[PDB]
């Protein structure tokens, strides 16, 4: 028997929705907008992703405003000719039954990974808030709820796992996003074609290791090779350096404090000279404070060279 949440999702997804089967490839979105933008009690339509291994036909789901006579809706849509080749016939929307929840790998439940995903989950909540112009506190409200209201039950990850599942579930219900497959969808029903039973977690046995040290050593070694073979392709910023010119520009952007609109002060050592523009200061720096600039552009070049030296000498303070 289906869980409350999966049963509820199912009913929510189909409620006030009509299926249009056998949607041909040549049928544009603009065509569908013409057909439905006029009809006021329609709120959304959602087209499925073509699956050419199986078939050249998508599915179109028409989502009606709350409390709509779904006979008035069938009648209002049935007989619309999108093009010469396809006229609409509305059908009661369907979701594949009698399925087992798609099991997620053990590693998704491991702490290091569970936390990465947690950071990626937050980033998708926030992506959904800008895209769909929603509130930005979804993340906060879910977390505050679980902190406050406990559960009746368990691994050492629980707090995170629990949060991850709900963050994942938020995306499913709201942003119709299957975090597990990284698929965005246009509607709940469309999503539930590929995950109708939802998902399950395979339990993490801590006893099981995949030579974590070895994959690290190898990883570190390959990162080291890249510093020598592909320095241009290496992420300097992540290694705590900047390309030379950027480093230097970021320093000038610190020691130049604009005091009004055409009033720019030089804050390099015991100076307080004022200029019309900032580039007038950038010159002043070059003329008067050369010594200081010479040092900055030296430090930028070495910092670049340093972070890219695989077997450089290192602060004793940053070992053991």
């Amino acid at each position: 028997q289906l869980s409350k949440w999966n049963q509820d999702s199912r009913n929510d997804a189909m409620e006030n929705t009509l299926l249009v089967s056998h949607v041909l490839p040549n049928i544009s979105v603009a065509q569908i907008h013409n057909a439905l933008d006029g009809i006021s009690f329609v709120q959304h339509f959602s087209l499925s992703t073509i699956n050419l291994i199986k078939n050249d036909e998508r599915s179109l789901w028409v989502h009606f405003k709350a409390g709509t006579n779904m006979d008035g809706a069938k009648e209002a849509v049935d007989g619309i000719q999108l093009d010469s080749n396809f006229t609409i016939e509305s059908e009661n929307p369907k979701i594949p039954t009698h399925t087992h929840p798609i099991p997620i790998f053990e590693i998704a439940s491991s702490e290091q990974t569970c936390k990465n995903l947690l950071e990626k989950l937050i980033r998708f909540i926030d992506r959904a808030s800008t895209k769909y112009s929603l509130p930005n506190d979804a993340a906060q409200r879910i977390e505050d709820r679980l902190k406050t209201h406990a559960s009746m039950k368990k691994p050492t990850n629980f707090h995170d796992i629990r949060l991850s599942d709900l963050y994942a579930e938020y995306l499913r219900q709201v942003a119709t996003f299957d975090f597990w497959t990284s698929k965005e969808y246009e509607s709940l029903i469309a999503l539930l074609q590929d995950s109708p039973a939802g998902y399950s977690r395979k339990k993490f046995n801590p006893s099981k290791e995949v030579g974590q040290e070895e994959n690290i050593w190898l990883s570190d070694l390959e990162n080291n090779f890249a510093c020598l073979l592909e320095p241009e392709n290496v992420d300097i910023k992540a290694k705590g350096a900047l390309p030379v010119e950027d480093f230097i520009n970021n320093e000038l952007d610190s020691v130049i404090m604009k005091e009004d609109e055409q009033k720019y002060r030089c804050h390099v050592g015991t100076c307080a000279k004022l200029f019309l523009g900032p580039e007038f200061v950038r010159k002043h720096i070059n003329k008067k404070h050369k010594d200081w600039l010479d040092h900055i552009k030296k430090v930028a070049i070495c910092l670049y060279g340093y972070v890219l030296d695989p077997c450089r000498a290192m602060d004793p303070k940053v070992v053991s």
Binding site: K273, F275, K283
Partner: peptide, 6 residues
């Protein structure tokens, strides 16, 4: 100096 305010 150049573009310097007083």
């Amino acid at each position: 100096e150049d573009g310097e305010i007083s």
